[PDB]
Symmetry: C2
Subunit: 212 residues, 2 copies
């Protein structure tokens, strides 16, 4: 679909390393295979928000800030603004704080010409307590607000088809990575499988092969 | 209670200004009235995590990192570690992601001799959708895990009393600020009331007078 982001090879790198030298090194080597890198707070809090612009300049990649924004609207607005001012192309936001908190992010994204991803669900064991039960309603909330981009877990293929049902065929959906997953998700996210490999470029190339 | 923190004058400054000069200027003036400052992402993402150490050194204050940590356990551990390495005395973490995500933070706090505050509820309109309904269970989850410190909303006195009932009289509870709030909360948090005042030192002094 034309109005949603084009992710090279349908593979996003989750660059979760906390030191700038390793992150830059492991990443530089895969820019041939990947054009979209997800960075989170472990790296940005350790090395500074300036690292976002550094990735974009050195690699020419799109940056998704995996900040799991989860505050009141006024604070959400400020987080999104600081993050986009630092150069992030997109930001991942929690839905559990409700519609006004999500809308706060959408407002800034619209102003600055950037993207908001709604995190609908999580796959770690504790997700069962509150998150799993809210996931469908969170997804519908996003749809009802015109959210275009979503993050969903891949540890359950039947969970992905359900999400895809809710958000429709036009929405952009990313999930952890893979053959089954991409029946539903537009792109898969790879972290350790790549950044802890001796030849990250090789590890990336491999995944992409299985993707064809 | 001896095993939980002493907050000077029962008043925490929420330093939500995003500019380092303004933040430092407003804060210095109230160090006489407050010894505990809450810093969030708007300031730290704008100015760098080094600002935490700067507050502690310039004012000798305790810093609570209002980062509303809400990720998977492995990522929570790293966020907490980076935050405590930067000098934060405490960190605020969401309970909605479940027990393992909270425990991840507790582990690092234990290791490094710092504190975790469990955010049990929020008071913005969107909180009604998912957070309000989870609040009591989140509070009980914290108690069951030995969490000592809690953040609760003050827009409803009767909500504070319920929280206090769950966490018991020994736990430390902080809430927005005021007279009846302190019947339940150990300390109140003041933000704009202070930092957007012509005489912050005055605005602070006044609040403390009401606290008697």
């Amino acid at each position: 679909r034309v109005d949603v982001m084009d992710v090279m090879n349908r593979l996003i790198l989750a660059m979760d390393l906390m030191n700038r030298d390793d992150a830059l090194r492991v990443t530089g080597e895969v820019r041939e295979y990947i054009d979209t890198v997800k960075i989170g707070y472990p790296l940005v809090l350790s090395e500074g928000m300036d690292i976002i612009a550094e990735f974009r300049k050195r690699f020419g990649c799109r940056i998704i800030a995996d900040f799991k924004v989860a505050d009141i609207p006024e604070t959400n607005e400020k987080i999104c603004r600081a993050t986009f001012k630092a150069g992030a192309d997109a930001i991942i936001v929690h839905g559990f704080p409700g519609a006004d908190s999500v809308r706060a992010c959408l407002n800034v994204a619209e102003e600055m010409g950037r993207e908001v991803f709604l995190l609908t669900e999580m796959s770690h064991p504790g997700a069962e307590m509150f998150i799993q039960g809210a996931a469908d309603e969170i997804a519908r909330m996003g749809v009802d607000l015109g959210v275009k981009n979503y993050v969903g877990p891949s540890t359950r293929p039947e969970r992905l088809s359900r999400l895809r049902e809710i958000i429709g065929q036009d929405s952009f959906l990313i999930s952890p990575g893979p053959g089954e997953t991409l029946r539903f998700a537009d792109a898969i996210i790879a972290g350790r499988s790549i950044y802890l490999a001796d030849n990250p470029a090789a590890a990336a190339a491999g995944i992409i092969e299985s993707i064809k």
